[PDB]
Structure 1
Amino acid sequence: MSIDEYKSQANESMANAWRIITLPNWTVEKRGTVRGDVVESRKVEGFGKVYRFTGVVNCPARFLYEEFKNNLTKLPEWNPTILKCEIIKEIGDGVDLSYQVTAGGRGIITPRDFVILRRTALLSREGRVVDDNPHGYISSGVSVQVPGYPPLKEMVRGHNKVGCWYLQPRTVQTPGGKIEDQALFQWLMCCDLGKIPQFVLDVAFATVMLDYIVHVRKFVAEAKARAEI
């Protein structure tokens, strides 16, 4: 693919993720331990069943955005569900190609690898790209083919149809009266996985998404402890 085909597909994917993740009327799949954590699903025409995690993380949304944007290769260090992450190429406008290997879930979601086209951007409330004072920070992802990264015989090549991390900044008052920045964290995931029935898939997807947030929160709490935030 040309730079332009990839940049096009990254833009289209980012607009699709933003449109989806802010659609109304979702169904609850699974609640987490932490108050407000939820995995929801919806039918989306041309995607099928999409899943969305929502919950609050105790850090500035910019901090996490910058970690995801600038330190994607370090995700394995703090997230055990991510085995490997490598930047293939960075093609401008916060667009890049990456190779990622994920761990298995309950034995439904097995280890998989992915070739991911991402755009990371700051968005207005209307989903336009801004340079500053964002309404939200987004990192969108879609699977693509990159010559040199064929499917391996020893691992299932996953296909991410649409997905994103979407962070919205929040400033709250603590119980002690401190004012501190927090982030609403949303994650949209839509895969083609077989003939495994949908009800089996729904439990396995929601469980993966709830396991992942544990490691984000641990990463945050370690950052807080070390006065990085």
Structure 2
Amino acid sequence: SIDEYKSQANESMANAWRIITLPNWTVEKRGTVRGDVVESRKVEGFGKVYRFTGVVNCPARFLYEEFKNNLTKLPEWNPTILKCEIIKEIGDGVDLSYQVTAGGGRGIITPRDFVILRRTALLSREGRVVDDNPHGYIVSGVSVQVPGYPPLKEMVRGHNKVGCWYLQPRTVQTPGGKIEDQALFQWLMCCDLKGKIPQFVLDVAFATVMLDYIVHVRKFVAEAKARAEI
């Protein structure tokens, strides 16, 4: 039934918004760009969740549209994304997707495929879905079993317990006096790694996988600004 999936995605978006806005994180790794940090925390009945925080020089809305509507275009500008299909679109910004990723953590996170149920909504500062003027833009994700899209014997089927892109609009003033649209880019990740790989190893790998990803996001943004798309 469709509604079993609609409920799973709304529940997943709320879990993600609530988690990503929780206080008191543990800094795992810092990034090259001032402000970039991958933090972590223990979350009841999830485990050790991870969060990248960083500032992106583009309207939050624009990044939101790219994730929502151009998911299949991700492999073109992000080499860590091998494949991106939209399996089904099921209403209220909800959809199923099949994603294939490449290796990370210099050999720890092997190439994995994913069956993702997403929720796409504009959230208020209270976490209610609004139609305009939002505190942030959410693109949630959670792994689901979809018949016809089973695990391949030749690839690890990864499991996203909870995740999201949480993008907050930020109009800043530049050194040259100009007023411009920017975005607070937050990324939640709770990927269960099958087997018993000791936690200190995973902390380095997940943090690396995240900091590596943001290099391409900024390349996508810089190019989009040059083609005056933003």
* Structures share fold, TM-score greater than 0.5: yes
| Residues 132-188 of structure 1: per-residue CA shift (max 9 Å, x gap) | 111100000000000000000000000000000000000000010000000000000
Give the number of aligned pairs: 228
Cα drift, residue 109 of structure 1: 0.2
| Counterpart contact for 2:28–2:37, Cα < 8 Å | yes
| Residues 82-120 of structure 1: per-residue CA shift (max 9 Å, x gap) | 000000000000000000000044100000000000001
Aligned equivalents of 1:185 and 1:96: distance in 2?
Answer: 22
Aligned equivalents of 1:102 and 1:54: distance in 2?
Answer: 21
SS at match of 1:216: helix
Aligned equivalents of 1:206 and 1:105: distance in 2?
Answer: 8
Aligned equivalents of 1:219 and 1:164: distance in 2?
Answer: 19
Cα drift, residue 79 of structure 1: 0.4
Cα drift, residue 10 of structure 1: 0.2
| Residues 64-89 of structure 1: per-residue CA shift (max 9 Å, x gap) | 00000000000000000000000000
Aligned equivalents of 1:207 and 1:143: distance in 2?
Answer: 22
TM-score normalised by structure 2 residue count: 0.98
Question: Which residue pairs with 1:93 in the alignment?
Answer: 92
| Residues 183-202 of structure 1: per-residue CA shift (max 9 Å, x gap) | 00000000110111000000
Question: Which residue pairs with 1:133 in the alignment?
Answer: 133
Aligned equivalents of 2:192 and 2:182: distance in 1?
Answer: 33
Identity of aligned residues (%): 100
Give the ranges of 4+ consecutive aligned residues of structure 1 lying more than 4 Å apart after TM superposition.
none
Where do 1:70-219 residues align within 5 Å?
Answer: 70-103=69-102, 104-193=104-193, 194-219=195-220
Aligned equivalents of 2:226 and 2:124: distance in 1?
Answer: 32
Aligned equivalents of 1:190 and 1:163: distance in 2?
Answer: 6
Query: RMSD of the TM alignment (CA)?
Result: 0.5
Cα drift, residue 57 of structure 1: 0.1
Structure 2 unpaired stretches of 5+: none
Structure 1 unpaired stretches of 5+: none
1:30 aligns with 2:29: yes
SS at match of 1:28: strand
Aligned equivalents of 2:73 and 2:16: distance in 1?
Answer: 24
| Counterpart contact for 2:115–2:145, Cα < 8 Å | yes
Aligned equivalents of 2:90 and 2:105: distance in 1?
Answer: 32
Q: 1:105 to 1:83 in 2, by over 3 A?
A: farther
Aligned equivalents of 1:82 and 1:146: distance in 2?
Answer: 21
TM-score normalised by structure 1 residue count: 0.99
